[PDB]
Amino acid sequence: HMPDLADLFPGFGSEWINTSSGRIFARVGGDGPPLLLLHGFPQTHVMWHRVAPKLAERFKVIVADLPGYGWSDMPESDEQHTPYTKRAMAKQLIEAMEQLGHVHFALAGHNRGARVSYRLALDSPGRLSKLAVLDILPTYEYWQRMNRAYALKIYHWSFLAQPAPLPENLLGGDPDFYVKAKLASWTRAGDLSAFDPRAVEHYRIAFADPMRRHVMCEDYRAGAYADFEHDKIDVEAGNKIPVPMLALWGASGIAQSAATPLDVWRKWASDVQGAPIESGHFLPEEAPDQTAEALVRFFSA
Amino acid sequence: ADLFPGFGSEWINTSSGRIFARVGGDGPPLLLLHGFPQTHVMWHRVAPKLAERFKVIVADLPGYGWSDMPESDEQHTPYTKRAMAKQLIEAMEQLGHVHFALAGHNRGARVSYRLALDSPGRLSKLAVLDILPTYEYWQRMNRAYALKIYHWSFLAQPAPLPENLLGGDPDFYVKAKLASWTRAGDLSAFDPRAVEHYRIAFADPMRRHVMCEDYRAGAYADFEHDKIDVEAGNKIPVPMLALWGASGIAQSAATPLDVWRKWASDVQGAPIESGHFLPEEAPDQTAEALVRFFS
Numbered sequence: 001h002m003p004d005l006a007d008l009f010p011g012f013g014s015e016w017i018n019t020s021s022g023r024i025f026a027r028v029g030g031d032g033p034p035l036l037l038l039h040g041f042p043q044t045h046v047m048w049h050r051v052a053p054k055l056a057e058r059f060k061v062i063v064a065d066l067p068g069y070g071w072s073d074m075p076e077s078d079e080q081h082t083p084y085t086k087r088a089m090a091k092q093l094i095e096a097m098e099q100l101g102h103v104h105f106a107l108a109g110h111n112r113g114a115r116v117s118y119r120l121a122l123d124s125p126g127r128l129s130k131l132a133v134l135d136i137l138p139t140y141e142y143w144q145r146m147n148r149a150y151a152l153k154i155y156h157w158s159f160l161a162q163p164a165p166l167p168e169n170l171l172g173g174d175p176d177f178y179v180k181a182k183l184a185s186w187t188r189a190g191d192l193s194a195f196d197p198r199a200v201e202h203y204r205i206a207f208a209d210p211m212r213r214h215v216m217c218e219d220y221r222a223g224a225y226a227d228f229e230h231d232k233i234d235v236e237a238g239n240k241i242p243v244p245m246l247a248l249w250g251a252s253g254i255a256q257s258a259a260t261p262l263d264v265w266r267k268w269a270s271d272v273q274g275a276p277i278e279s280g281h282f283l284p285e286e287a288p289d290q291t292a293e294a295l296v297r298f299f300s301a
Numbered sequence: 302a303d304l305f306p307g308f309g310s311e312w313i314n315t316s317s318g319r320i321f322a323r324v325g326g327d328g329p330p331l332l333l334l335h336g337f338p339q340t341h342v343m344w345h346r347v348a349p350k351l352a353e354r355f356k357v358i359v360a361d362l363p364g365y366g367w368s369d370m371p372e373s374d375e376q377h378t379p380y381t382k383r384a385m386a387k388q389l390i391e392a393m394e395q396l397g398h399v400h401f402a403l404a405g406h407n408r409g410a411r412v413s414y415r416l417a418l419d420s421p422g423r424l425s426k427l428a429v430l431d432i433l434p435t436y437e438y439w440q441r442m443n444r445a446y447a448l449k450i451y452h453w454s455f456l457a458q459p460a461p462l463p464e465n466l467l468g469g470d471p472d473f474y475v476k477a478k479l480a481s482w483t484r485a486g487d488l489s490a491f492d493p494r495a496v497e498h499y500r501i502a503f504a505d506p507m508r509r510h511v512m513c514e515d516y517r518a519g520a521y522a523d524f525e526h527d528k529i530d531v532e533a534g535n536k537i538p539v540p541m542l543a544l545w546g547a548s549g550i551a552q553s554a555a556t557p558l559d560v561w562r563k564w565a566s567d568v569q570g571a572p573i574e575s576g577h578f579l580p581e582e583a584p585d586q587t588a589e590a591l592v593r594f595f596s
Contacts, residue, residue, distance in 0.1 A: 148439040151447045151454040152520055158451040166477060173469015181462065224448055 001071070005205060006198040008049035009063065012056070017064075019095040021083060022073030026064040026096075030056025033129070034102045035299060036093070037063045040111020041216055042179050043282075044070035046202045047110070050288035051295065058296055062100065066113060067092050068215035070206055077215075081222040084215060086112075086139075087230055090120035094127055103127065106299045110134040110284060112219055115227065118268070121241040122234050130299055132246040134291070135253040135281050137264050139223055140231035145258055153257055156182070160220035167217045172210055179207035186281035188252045194286040240270045246298045247274035248291065253281040273298075302494035304345035305359065307352070313360075315391040317379060318369025322360040322392075326352030329425070330398040331595060332389070333359045336407020337512055338475045340366035342498045343406070346584035347591065354596060355402070362409055363388050364511035366502055373511075377518040380511060382408075382435075383526055386416035390423055402595050404428040406580065408515055411435060411523065414564070417537040418530055426595055428542040430579045430587070431549040433560050435519055436527030441554045449553055452478070456516035463513045468506055475503035482577035484548050490582040536566045542594040543570035544587065549577040569594070 012029035027045060035055060037048045045063045055061045065072040067089045075083035082088055093116065097105055106129050109117035114133040121131050142157065151158065160167050171178055180192065183203065187194045206212050247265045249255040262274040275294065279286040308325030323341060331351060333344045341359040351357045361368040363385045371379035371388075378384050389412065393401060402425050405413035410429040417427050438446070438453065447454065456463045467474055476488060479499065483490045502508050529535075543561045545551040551560075558570035571590060575583035 143444040146442065146444045146447050148442050148520075148524070151442050152457060155451075155454040155458055158447040159455045161448060162451055166474075169470055169473050170466040174465060177465060224444075228444070 002205065005202055008046050008196070008198060008202075009052060012052070012061075012063070017096040017099045019092050019099070021067060021088070021092040021095070022075050024064050024067070024093065024096040025071035026062050027052070028060070028062050029053075030059055030061045032059045033299075034097075034100075034105040035059040035061050036097060036102075036105055036107045037061065038066060038093070038107070038109035038113025038116055039069070040066070040109070040113045040115075041219065042182055042207055043111070043203050044206050046199050047282065048284055049196070049199060051284045051292035054292040055295060058300055059106070062097070062102075064093065064096065066116065068219070069212070074211055074215050077218045080226055081218045082226070084218040085222040085226045085230070086115045086119035087123060087226070089116045090123060094120065094124060097127075104129060106130050108132040108134065108295055111136065111281070115139055115223070118241065119227070119230065121243045121245075122239060125241065125243050128243045130244045130246070131241070132248065132295060132298060133265075134283050135249045135255045137255045137259055137261060138231050138235075138268055139227045140235055141259070141264055143224075143228050150258060154254060157220060157223060160217050161224035164214070164217065168210065168214055171213050175207050175213065176204055179204055183282075186254060187286055188250070188278070188280040194280070194282060196285070199285070235268070241268060241272075242270055245269045245272040246294070247272060248283060248294055249274070249276055250279035250281055250283055250286070251276045253279065253283075302497070304342055304492070304494060305348060308348070308357075308359070313392040313395045315388050315395070317363065317371045317384075317388045317391075320360050320363065320389065320392040321367035322358050323348070324356070324358050326355050326357045328355050329595075330393075330396075330401040331355040331357050332393065332401055332403045333357065334362060334389070334403070334405035334409025334412055335365070336362070336405070336409045336411075337515065338478050338503055339407070339499050340502050342495050343578065344580055345492070345495060347580045347588040350588040350592060351595075354592065358393075358396070358398075360389065360392065362412065364515070365508070370507060370511055373514045376522055377514045378522070380514040381518040381522045381526070382411045382415035383419060383522075385412045386419060390416070390420060393423075399423065400425055402426045404430065404591055406430040407432065407577070411519070414537065415523070415526065417539045417541070418535060421537065421539050424539045426541070427537070427539045428544065428591055428594060429561075431545045431551050431577050433551050433555055433557060434527050434564055435523045436531055437555065437560055439524055446554050450550065453516060453519065456513050457520035460510070460513065464506065464510055467509050471503050471509065472500055475499055479578070482550065483582055484546070484574075484576040490576070490578060492581070495581070530564075536564055538566055541565045541568040542590070543568055544579060544590055545570070545572055546575035546577055546579055546582070547572045549575065549579070
């Protein structure tokens, strides 16, 4: 519905899926077993545009905007940031998938979307055939690593979780500059060259809306509070994801800082494989051919 | 507004630039150092009572308020506490004070205990208000503390990120920091004319850049300087007073007198019912405690 934004999934349909928490926007393509792809921050569903055509050669691919992101609706939040907790987002996306007739599907997520994905696997494992998480550790593991070096290296988790309207007021002075600098700052080279400029305009246009930025802050507030508490319950109970799992991360990404990610994920999951890729955080755009191959082989095995 | 009746206004030369100070009283010399996001005026409610008994020098930190702004470098050197202490030692020498009493709050309390570790002969007595050493805050930087004092990491990010974010609405940020660290949670502990001093200083992008350089030093060289003293078991030998707010920052993740007793061989301390901004939130109790200690 935005005239000047490009169509980066030629051939894919476009659907508005109703749920009890609001509409989920998605591009839908391909044919075969169902595969849901979930972006994160500060992006929208379009960050899958370099791998989704390849995946659609082998799967029915659903590329969804997270609750409150992109063109999905933005539920009003509350004092516990409930609609933007990964538990609620996973429930909402389960409903959306049911609208399409998918009650058991494959799932790949990146960034916040990967957090939705592993929470979905901890709360509702029967919904997933297989799961892949891209350049993340569990939210509990980010916070347990917190120290001086980590606080300086990855500041925005604590910044964006500050009580409203502090991050909102600071982000709104020059939002284009912030979102473009965040995108560049976590690539391997530190610039915007890994991104299609038409995809960057999608991200910029989303980030230009104060309502969209507020959702992002609520998401990070959930990530500091309820999401962390939910994860803490699972790890202290020794609960492990039983769904077969793939952890892909960037050699220069966020997840690897002071971590061996596959060893971390083996604490959280009983059947997990994984590998690094030479990349910053944004695997599907920085290393699309290798990411698409890793996903196709994992989900088709 | 002039909030220091009976005080002069002095520009004091140093090799790094001028230090501005309000000066009043007579008797033994006592230097007062403010911190962030404030200026010398945050002492306006206690400096009169101290000037009954002391010559009181209320100085703007290097780069803050009306003091000159030395040019920084890639290691943030002029805004390290060791460098700020050296510059203020020079300023005090311009007035003929080579052995003086010293009280600091926030960043200025960090200048102050660094001064005591580097040049203890300069100090008769030291008071620090609502801080622990920079090293101790970073050692405590877990999830809970990263959320509570997020600005230690945010303002320390590489330029221009905090500078750019702060330039959108500087008045909001400075007022938010002031209110959020008080007991009341609003601006009602502050004199409106003092707030206006802080807002005017914070409105200048050059002043905000200094403040970020100060927090960058606090994340790097200040931390390393403190770590050397810890590793060496160095304790401040200057008689010392640690005051902190019962709902302030220093008590948040630590037992303040227990911490300072590891850094100082002769330290007394007390909590005061106050948030972080002791001299404005709790002026009578803060002034009483300082008067009795320095006398």
